[PDB]
Amino acid sequence: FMNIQLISPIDAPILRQWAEIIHRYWPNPSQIRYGTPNVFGSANLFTPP
Amino acid sequence: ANVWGVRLADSLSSPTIETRTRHYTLHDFYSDLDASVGKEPWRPLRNQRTNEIVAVQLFRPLQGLVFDTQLYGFPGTFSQWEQFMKEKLRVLKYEVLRIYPISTYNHDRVNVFVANALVGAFLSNQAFYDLLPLLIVNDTMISDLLGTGAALSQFFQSHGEVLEVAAGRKYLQMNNYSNDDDDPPLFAKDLSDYAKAFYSDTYEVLDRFFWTHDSSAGVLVHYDKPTNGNHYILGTLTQMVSAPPHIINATDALLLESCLEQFAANVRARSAQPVTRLDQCYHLRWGAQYVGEDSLTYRLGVLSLLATNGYQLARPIPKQLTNRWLSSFVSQVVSDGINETPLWPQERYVQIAYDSPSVVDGATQYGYVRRNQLRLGMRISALQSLSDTPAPVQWLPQYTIDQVAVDEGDAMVSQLTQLPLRPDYGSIWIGEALSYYVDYNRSHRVVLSSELPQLPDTYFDGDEQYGRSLFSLARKVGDRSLVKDTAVLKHAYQAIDPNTGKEYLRAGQSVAYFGASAGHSGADQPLVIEPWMQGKISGVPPPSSVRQFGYDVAKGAIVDLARPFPSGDYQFVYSDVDQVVDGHDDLSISSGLVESLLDSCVHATAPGGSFVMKINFPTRTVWHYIEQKILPNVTSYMLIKPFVTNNVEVFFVAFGVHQQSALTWTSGVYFFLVDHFYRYETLSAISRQLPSFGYVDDGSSVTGIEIISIENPGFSNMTQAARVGISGLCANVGNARKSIAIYESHGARVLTITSRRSPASARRKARLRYLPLIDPRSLEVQARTILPSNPVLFDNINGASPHVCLTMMYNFEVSSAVYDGDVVLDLGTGPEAKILELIPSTSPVTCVDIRPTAQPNGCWNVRTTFLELDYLSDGWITGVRGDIVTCMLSLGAAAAGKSMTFDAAFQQLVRVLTRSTANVLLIQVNCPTDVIRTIKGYLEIDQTNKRYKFPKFGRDEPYSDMDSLERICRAAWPNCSITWVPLSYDLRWTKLALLESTTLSSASVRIAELMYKYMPIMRIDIH
Amino acid sequence: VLSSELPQLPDTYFDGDEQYGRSLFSLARKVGDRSLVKDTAVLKHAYQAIDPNTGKEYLRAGQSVAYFGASAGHSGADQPLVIEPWMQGKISGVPPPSSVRQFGYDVAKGAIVDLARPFPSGDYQFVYSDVDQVVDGHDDLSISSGLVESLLDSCVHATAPGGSFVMKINFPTRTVWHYIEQKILPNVTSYMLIKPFVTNNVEVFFVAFGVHQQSALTWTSGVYFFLVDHFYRYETLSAISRQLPSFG
Amino acid sequence: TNEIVAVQLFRPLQGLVFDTQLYGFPGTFSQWEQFMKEKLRVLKYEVLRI
DSSP, rough: OOOSSSOSSOOTHHHHHHHHHHHHHHHOOOOOOOTTTTTOOOOOOSOOO | XXSSSSOOOOOOOOOOBBOOOOOBHHHHHHHSSSSSSSOOOOOOEEEESSSSSSEEEEETTBBBSSSSSHHHOOOHHHHHHHHHHHHHHHHHHHHHHHHSSSSSOOOOOHHHHHHHHHHHHHTSSSOTTTGGGGGOOOSSSSHHHSSSOOTTTTTTTEEOOOEOOOOOSEEEEEEEOOOOOOOOOTTTTTSSSEEEEEESSHHHHHHHHHHHHHOOSHHHHHHHHSSSSEEEEOSOOEEEETTTTTOOHHHHHHHHHHHHHHHTTTOOOOOSSBBBBOOOOOOSSSSGGOOOOHHHHHHHHHHHHHHHHHBSSOOOOSSEEEEEEEHHHHHHHSSSOOSSSSOOOOOOOOOOOOOOOOOHHSSSSSSEEEEOOOOOOOOOOOOOOOOOOOOEEOOOOEEEEEHHHHHHHHHHHHOOOOOOOOOOOSSSBBOOOEEEEEEOOOOOOBBOOGGGGOOOOOOOOOOHHHHHHHHHHOBBBBBBBHHHHHHHHHHHTSOOOOSSSSSSSOOOEEEEEEEOOOOOOOOOTTHHHHHHHHTSSSSOOSSSSSESSSTOSSBOOOOOSSSSOOOOSSEEEEEEOOOOOOOOHHHOHHHHHHHHHHHHHHHHHHOEEEEEEEEEEOHHHHHHHHIIIIIIHOOOEEEEESSSSSOOOOOEESTTTOOOOOOOOOHHHHHHHHHHHHHHHHHHHHHHSSSSOOOOOOOOOSEEEEOOOOEOOSOOOOOHHHHHHHHHHHHSSSSSSEEEEEEETTTEEEEEEEEEEEEHHHHHHHHEEEEEEEEEEGSSSSOSOOOOOOOBBBBOOOOOOOOHHHHHHHHHHEEEEEEEESSOEEOOOOOOOOGGTTTTOOOOOEEEESSOOOOOOOOOSOOOOEEEEOTSSSSSSTTOOOOOOESSSSSHHHHHHTTTOOOHHHHHHHHHHHOOOSEEEEEEOOOSSSSSOOOOTTTTSSSSSSSOTTTTTTTTTOOOOOOHHHHHHHHHHHEEEEEEEOTTTGGGGGHHHHHTTTTOOSSSHHHHHHHTTTEEEEEEEEE | GGGSHHHHHOTTTTTTHHHHHHHHHHHHHHHHHHEEEEHHHHHHHHOOOSSSSSSSSSSSSSEEEEEEOOOOOOSSSSOOOOOOHHTTEEEEEEEEOOOOOSTTTTTTEEOOOSSOOOOOOOOOOOEEEEEOSSSOOOSOOOHHHHHHHHHHHHHHHHHTTTTTEEEEESOOOOOHHIIIIIIHHHSEEEEEEEEEOSSSSOOOOEEEEEEOOOOOOOOOHHHHHHHHHHHHHHHHHHHHHHSSSSOO | OOOOOOOOTTTTTOOOSSSHHHTTSSSSHHHHHHHEEEEEEEEHHHHHHH
């Protein structure tokens, strides 16, 4: 699963193509900015506030 | 230097002149849409092996391809994709041209972001018409786009004084991009969202932007010349694999491509042509706390600082990057090791050292800070790379006065030599056969048959059979029967008869052949019968008919040649049927078969005929029988021997059978048999010291190959360990040729040194108490890639030249003349210092020259002296002390240099040797002994002006007379006794030649035997 | 004329503007191979000279020469590009020699040696040396001047019987002129110095005739005026090349 | 017929103990050789990483 070269694209079927789709089109994270640290402060850890 | 993978030494460089840019106008934006054949945005990348288009790099007007690949519906092949794009861009061009007329064309700037996002919306069918009134710019590029909300949020968005665009797809992947190792890498730029750019006016807004928002992956800057205003680049956490031992996320590939572009651009700088950016690098700004110490991001940040300061890589960068080379570079940089460079990355500012050649610190406004504290010890210039030279090239060593102990060199090369390998053997002896003949003369001498020598008893032994079989395997011929029979058949016709005047035999002979084989796909006959019938030999006349007999005939009759058989007589008969297949370990039967064969061979010839019969084992009973019976009944006789395989066989040729006369043996036949047996003895002694045919080597044999393999990272001064190893090789093999080959093996640069040890070099090694050290200056310079080859034991496949074969003839006589424990003095070096390997080990030497020597001085086991004084002068032999002088191939050059005669040169030499203390001496003189033949191609003398005219060297020398030179010794000393050593037919001299791994010849040895007859060496001894 | 009055290269030679003016001309020059054009131009003029001792000529066909400093660096398969036409006689102003042996750091068929320190070889009737010494010679003139005499001492000894050599001097300096006046100038029969002009620099070629023939030679006002014109032709084109704009 | 009908194997691959249908080899030698050369480098990088 980590290196998809091990799955043979000569014995042609699906498990190479599906493992390619998992690497290509699985969604990526983001960030949205909550909070009002002027009054409330900020209670989160391990991230910036 | 090195960080983890080595870069190039002191010469660091950088571009100097930066060109300035111009704004992107509508006059250019119209021209970019109707893509002409000369100017078009896309340019194709291609595979290096298959030479097929696999990827497309995109430029200025379309760089907004942020959506997925299935949204666009692009074709698979490049030729269809290009026509697709050219067809669609004009449909967009008329839509631009309707709203904005072309009468506004002069100096109207367009918004670059709107220009990219418009074609990105039109190629993806996503609401382009809002962006079209925002195409013409006003008051800046960004602030026209901050407040609006017209375009779709995937293209760009605003966070308040910060514009965020989504840069996408610098490269574009075609249909036949199959992630091959020769494919060009794409650096995660064929993907939808690999980075996000953040545009603003000043950096103080973006620095407050990245206080609230996260900088987890890492943020990147340009700091030299931003594309559309100053901005930051934030990488995502998607991953390009592209390199099967590695996984590289986007924020590392985005840094790595920009590092490699600057490493490439630091080499191409020639200090006259301008570039578009003084540096290409990125220099990570905020996320350096979140990235790991000594991880890939940190190491690429170190390399990105090095590229900005202007360092250069050791191995060269290809013009187009390959996916295998990129993986090798990443695996080379993720190795272990410490940062040798005093540079270190910092978040606050990217620093530039004091003597860095980059002038960008004064060019840009800020970001770059000329730090004065840290200083690097390098001087500025570009590197010098060059071609490959795919054959291994010969190297010669030079020495230095320092030294180590001799037990260090072998112990050092014990871990460096890859001795257990199988070299290709080659061939000892090449070409045709050498004809050694002797003819019966009337007035030489009578000698009885009981005093002739026979073969030794140590002939059927295992080592002797091994020495015969090794030479028979290493001999390279065509057909043995062809080469033997033509050599005997040519010499059998130059003989003239004594009874009449003309000749024994003519054309039209009606001969019989005994012992045909036709055994190796020669269709019916031995291979000489058809050219001898057609007259293709050109030294023979054609006969009338040939009839065959023997056990292995194909067209003749099969009989037993011992017992008589029904046939007729013949005018000539050739018999070469062997008798010694049964003749092993029982000599009597093999001797007994020969007389029974000869009694049948004589009777089938009787009227005035002649026969040729092959004797393999010449024994005393055979000589006695032919002296008793065969010798009276013939007119004349001769015995010759073509030499093509090391054995003791001969050929017996008799002339004028059944003519009753009286003949005896002679001292010519006696000396011929002595030389014939001793030439077997010498080569049989030589062939046992050689290794076997398909051996693997281990360094245990006396002669053989030996190689090393030591790495050489970049322009590194080699250590004492590698120097001791190379000097140990140069002490283990001496005065031989050394071939080297520098090549990247297993992802690492390594060089080999190939040479061939010898018993002469083993003798040389014993003469030194300490081994010298070579200088590394000949090997530290090399920056090329010499492709290697498989090692062979015998390198020279063309063979030795006659001037080398004659040099062996001189050197063997010198080495046989010098005994153990004697002072000598060399009179002239020659081409090399061979003399140090010729004399025995305990003998102290000295050598005179006209040039400074190159042999190492000091740390020897016995005294030596290397000095040059132009030895024709006087007043210097009284200071020196020796016992025998050796002039070899130098007196003719000394005579030709001063343009004096050979008589005056030899007179001056003997006049200066009158002051010597030596008693015995031998020196090379150049005077003809025999009647002059002036052999073609190699030695064309003049009778009048008395020159030699060697055409292979353009040299000529005066010859003198033996009678003119004989009176000089009598005038010099009363008790001198000259002797002229004859050239010995035995080839005794080849011990120096074959054991030092030299495939000799067939013709050049005969030419050297002819050439020594014009330059014989002489030997004088007083009292 | 004595050797102390001959001009040398100016001090304003290693400067940035001078290096820029050299590099611009080297980029704008359109040639084939620089080694080809230099070596044919020196090799044609090296054969029209006739000897004063006899009447005919210094050297003939069949010379058995040695070549110093081969490159074969730009897909010339094994050799510098003059050796094959000079062996085949395609130049038509030359006679063909007998054999050519190569030496230098970048050989492909000859031996790789260090030409300063002596090395095992034989003598030759002619030897052509054009190995540059000024790659290390930037901002430190003494080492580049010092390498030339050590190279010439090895170049003379490999020639000795009645021979001749051609040696390339890139930086003509006062120590070089004094050394060749002291040592090289008496031991030769005749000499000449030529310069093919294909790239704007200060390099010259030194050609000596009849080595190890003890005679008495001096410099001359012809060599003086030749060096004045040789340096001033660098000065004019170096002044011109700085007013021109860059390449791209 | 002078046609390739069998292949003798040497030192690095001599462990082909399973059945022939498990491997999925091609029928012709020219395709089989390219198949094997393509798969052995994919194994080579897996050895080379560790």
